[PDB]
Design an enzyme around this catalytic site. Structure first.
Site, short mmCIF file in Angstrom:
data_model
loop_
_atom_site.label_atom_id
_atom_site.label_comp_id
_atom_site.label_asym_id
_atom_site.label_seq_id
_atom_site.Cartn_x
_atom_site.Cartn_y
_atom_site.Cartn_z
N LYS B 35 51.48 31.23 42.69
CA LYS B 35 50.15 31.73 42.99
C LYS B 35 49.32 30.43 43.35
CE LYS B 35 47.07 33.24 39.85
NZ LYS B 35 45.70 32.30 40.28
N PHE B 64 42.61 34.18 46.40
CA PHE B 64 41.20 33.89 46.78
C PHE B 64 40.38 34.61 46.53
CE2 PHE B 64 43.38 31.07 50.81
CZ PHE B 64 43.82 30.40 49.96
N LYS B 65 40.71 35.64 45.54
CA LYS B 65 39.64 36.61 45.24
C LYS B 65 38.51 37.16 46.21
CE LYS B 65 40.73 35.50 40.38
NZ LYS B 65 41.55 34.76 40.90
N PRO B 173 47.39 38.09 34.83
CA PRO B 173 47.18 36.86 34.30
C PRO B 173 46.56 36.89 32.80
CG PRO B 173 45.62 37.75 35.74
CD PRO B 173 46.46 38.68 35.57
N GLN B 178 44.96 31.97 27.66
CA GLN B 178 43.89 33.06 27.19
C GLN B 178 44.03 34.10 26.20
OE1 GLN B 178 41.70 34.66 31.02
NE2 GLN B 178 43.38 33.62 32.10
N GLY B 183 55.69 39.17 26.46
CA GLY B 183 56.51 40.43 25.98
C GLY B 183 55.26 41.67 26.05
N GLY B 195 49.68 29.96 33.77
CA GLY B 195 48.97 28.57 34.56
C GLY B 195 49.12 27.44 33.41
O1 LIG Z 1 41.71 38.54 35.67
C1 LIG Z 1 42.00 37.10 36.34
C2 LIG Z 1 42.75 37.18 37.62
C3 LIG Z 1 43.19 36.06 37.76
O2 LIG Z 1 43.64 35.93 38.87
N1 LIG Z 1 43.16 34.93 37.01
C4 LIG Z 1 43.80 33.54 37.30
O3 LIG Z 1 44.99 33.38 36.92
C5 LIG Z 1 45.17 32.14 36.32
C6 LIG Z 1 45.19 32.20 34.93
O4 LIG Z 1 45.84 30.86 34.58
P1 LIG Z 1 45.95 30.31 33.13
O5 LIG Z 1 47.47 30.89 32.43
O6 LIG Z 1 45.89 28.96 32.91
O7 LIG Z 1 44.88 31.07 32.26
C7 LIG Z 1 44.10 31.28 37.12
O8 LIG Z 1 44.52 30.88 38.40
C8 LIG Z 1 43.02 32.41 37.23
O9 LIG Z 1 42.12 31.92 38.24
C9 LIG Z 1 42.93 35.04 35.78
O10 LIG Z 1 43.01 34.18 34.89
N2 LIG Z 1 42.28 36.07 35.40
#
Ligand SMILES: O=c1cc(O)n([C@@H]2O[C@H](COP(=O)(O)O)[C@@H](O)[C@H]2O)c(=O)[nH]1
Ligand SMILES: O=c1cc(O)n([C@@H]2O[C@H](COP(=O)(O)O)[C@@H](O)[C@H]2O)c(=O)[nH]1
EC number: 4.1.1.23
Lengths: 218, 219
Positions: B35, B64-65, B173, B178, B183, B195
């Site tokens: 992604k 690109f939301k 995600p 976060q 799992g 990410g």
């Molecule tokens: O609800 C959503 C939708 C996303 O695309 N994202 C995207 O997914 C990725 C999360 O990355 P990370 O594992 O570092 O938290 C980031 O690119 C963020 O822009 C998100 O975190 N939450």
């Protein structure tokens, strides 16, 4: 923000030559250009610096920022590094996401525009019902710049009421989408105009014509 | 649906071509789906998609939301697919016409749309959460087959899976940094997006391998 003729050009042409030519043709009428993803994703972020070099206009990056706070921060940093003076951010994803953009803008000497209600028909489905609350959130966060819809002047008027006369309000949906320049300027500080200018047979005449129609408002 | 290796999608949000290329190359044995979002694209250009395809041959989801009016959405999708993205992520909250605009371009160009329903960050609770079930239902009605929902709210992810059905493809995600669990997320999502837990690790390959080991029984 002092926008010449209360008119912001939405430069959504997707070819560098055309975008530069058309902007040059209307340069006497404007000093503020909104550059969005259609142009940026077609020609690169360096297009922003090119516009500043050629026209010495202010640049609003219309990127509809709508991610999580961490990603929003990155987007704003990259955008301001490219020389944008301001960035447009969605309010719908919530306060933390907006604050992330406000923080970067403060760090780099730029402005955030909070997009409350959008101008297209689909905005009625989810955005419209949240828009007053998004505007109040803006006020709570100290946001001073907003966007609302030319296509719904009663909604634009309500947004103006919420944010007060001191806040800066821009409004798209003029022309192609059905909004009227003069009616929109009853409430907004500046109108955004894209296709009515850049798709016109004679873009300079189109800009001049719009400005003529609002001449008493200048 | 796309066959995501190890049910694991890399969120490549590094902002420098050298680092982004290094890390992606290091995890290539574990991940065939990447992604790429605006942090990298706005820093390095749309040609970064071309470079990833050339170097890794990975599938590319352009995160690109997309969240504009229909006419602008169409232009964004055209530019994105022209550059070689396999798929694009689109917000549902701007409504059905804005989503349809993206679907129409994807259909014309032989690519895919992922509809973002609920988001994973705390602010999503203010406005998005209350619209998300309807956004998902709207997606189903429009014929959307690919969706994103939040790892950080298992109850919400489960409901979104119910709405879209078992045949739809769901990515998620919010795993790792976060707070979401790999799992548990894969109880509902087809694939997890990761990410920072990978790209900020001292050893991104070991980080990816560790995540995969933890979900081995789900592969
Ligand atoms: O609800 C959503 C939708 C996303 O695309 N994202 C995207 O997914 C990725 C999360 O990355 P990370 O594992 O570092 O938290 C980031 O690119 C963020 O822009 C998100 O975190 N939450
Ligand atoms: O509510 C909104 C917010 C926008 O930024 N816009 C943007 O403003 C411009 C409107 O252009 P036009 O005058 O061609 O309709 C486009 O760049 C669009 O992306 C909009 O139309 N409605």
């Amino acid at each position: 923000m002092d926008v010449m003729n209360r008119l912001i050009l939405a430069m959504d042409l997707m070819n560098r030559d055309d975008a530069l030519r058309v902007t040059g043709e209307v340069r006497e009428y404007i000093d503020t250009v909104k550059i969005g993803y259609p142009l940026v994703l077609s020609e690169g972020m360096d297009i922003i610096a090119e516009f500043r070099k050629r026209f010495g206009c202010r640049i609003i990056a219309d990127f509809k920022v709508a991610d999580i706070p961490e990603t929003n921060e990155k987007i704003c940093r990259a955008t301001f590094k490219a020389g944008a003076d301001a960035i447009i951010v969605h309010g719908f994803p919530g306060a933390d996401s907006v604050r992330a953009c406000l923080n970067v803008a403060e760090e780099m000497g730029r402005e955030v525009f909070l997009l409350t209600e959008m101008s297209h028909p689909g905005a009625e489905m989810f955005i419209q019902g949240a828009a007053d609350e998004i505007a109040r959130m803006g006020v709570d966060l100290g946001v001073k710049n907003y966007s609302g819809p030319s296509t719904r002047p009663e909604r634009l008027s309500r947004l103006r009421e919420i944010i007060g006369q001191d806040s800066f309000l821009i409004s798209p949906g003029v022309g192609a989408q059905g909004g009227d320049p003069g009616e929109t300027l009853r409430f907004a500080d500046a109108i955004i105009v894209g296709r009515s200018i850049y798709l016109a047979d004679n873009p300079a005449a189109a800009a001049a014509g719009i400005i003529e129609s609002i001449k008493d408002l200048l």
